Design a protein around this ligand. Sequence first.
Ligand code: HEM
Ligand SMILES: CCCCC[C@@H]1O[C@@H]1C/C=C\CCCCCCCC(=O)O
Ligand SMILES: CCCCCCCC
Length: 466
Amino acid sequence: DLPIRNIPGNYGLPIVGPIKDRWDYFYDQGAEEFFKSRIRKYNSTVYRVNMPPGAFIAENPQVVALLDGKSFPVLFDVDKVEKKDLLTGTYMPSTELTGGYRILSYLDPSEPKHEKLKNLLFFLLKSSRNRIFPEFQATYSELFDSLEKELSLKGKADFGGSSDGTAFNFLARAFYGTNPADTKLKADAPGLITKWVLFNLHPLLSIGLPRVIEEPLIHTFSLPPALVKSDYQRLYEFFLESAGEILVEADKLGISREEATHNLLFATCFNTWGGMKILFPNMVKRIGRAGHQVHNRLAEEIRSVIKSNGGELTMGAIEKMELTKSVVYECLRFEPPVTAQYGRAKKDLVIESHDAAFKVKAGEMLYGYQPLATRDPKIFDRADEFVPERFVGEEGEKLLRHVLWSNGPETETPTVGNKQCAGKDFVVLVARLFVIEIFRRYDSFDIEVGTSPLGSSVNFSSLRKA
Ligand code: HEM
Ligand SMILES: CCCCC[C@@H]1O[C@@H]1C/C=C\CCCCCCCC(=O)O
Ligand SMILES: CCCCCCCC
């Protein structure tokens, strides 16, 4: 059996310990090296550490970090961890930001409204099933038209600053059969959502600014929700007026119209649009870096399969695209869009890692940095390499149980009883559609890459048309 080890690490002195750890995390090391340096120092993938934000935003920055793929899955086990009010970690954004409601993502499965609200989103997704393909193809075709246009003018095309409007338009049309251009939102949604997301997540982000500016402005106190209230109201009235069909189902599930609307706003703007804002530019970055031979292989597969399908792109056609499916899973393994999962121990636990077991007490906050679980070299070969074909074939597919992007194994299903992403299948689908749209149009591409507060900044510098 595994030896019991004391959990290494410490929290330093009051006040100054957490501050120095925050400086390492944001400025002097960055998240990955913050965690890896401590793995090396402590010779352990489980250890005590302070997490941001602390200061006057979080009451208690103290966590036990789980940084390997054996220990991490404890965070999925709803019998071992409580998942209440910890979506964003050791603080929770004011409910003033969300209409006075505790939204679904913050609810533990023991709360009755968790089941109701998750069932509502499952309905939203199922009801959209026949709109996803045509609306994705229409909106993303327009995006690539715009990018070609920009490349011709500037010699480079900024992906993110057009793709955010594309994603919102796509979601409004797919989920609600509504074109935002036909509404009072016009083209304003990305700006409105970005500001509101910043008010929620600023304690966890760096914008770029020097620490002497950022620390007092975004890392010490919460930004006042009052300042984003009017912007949120514009979004709210869009959802109230556009979500008629879904609100009928909310009524049947026994959810108030107002509670339903705030929840649809959050699922659409925060979970979906926000998640896509991180994922899509990251996919362009990693696929871009994979090189032109990989691009050509994807183009050849995708185009051949669609030709075999009489030119009609369907769910069944996608199942034939082995490399495409594998590349999407490899993006999600290599660079999980949301890196931080938390859970509070409900009872005394014994957590097993690769070489030791550790005991934690009821009430301890557990934290996982997902990239260290999904790039764990004790689980994956070539763990730090992006390998496009990793998940191709029977043996490769077995490894999907260790892909964790959805807050559960990729082989498992989200349910009302767990806290796995309600949109799991939707995300994988639209990520596949995104790769398909690129390579049906282009043989290959080149990119330029920079940092962004969320995800990556990506420019196309060449788009080689078919
Ligand atoms: C690329 C896009 C997305 C990413 C990266 C993503 C990722 C995640 C992650 C990591 C969690 C776990 C949160 C936690 O720490 O507890 C989560 C939960 C959740 N996500 Fe997704 N998600 C995406 C898209 C979507 C979509 C399309 C939906 C539509 C329903 C959605 C709805 C939810 C909901 C409702 C939860 C909370 C589930 C519950 O309370 O049981 N997300 N997501
Ligand atoms: C703008 C929010 C994007 C993520 C939405 C996705 O639905 C899940 C929400 C899960 C956690 C919320 C906090 C996300 C912070 C993301 C940046 C830092 C990180 O990756 O840990
Ligand atoms: C980076 C914090 C700026 C806050 C914006 C307030 C808008 C009135």
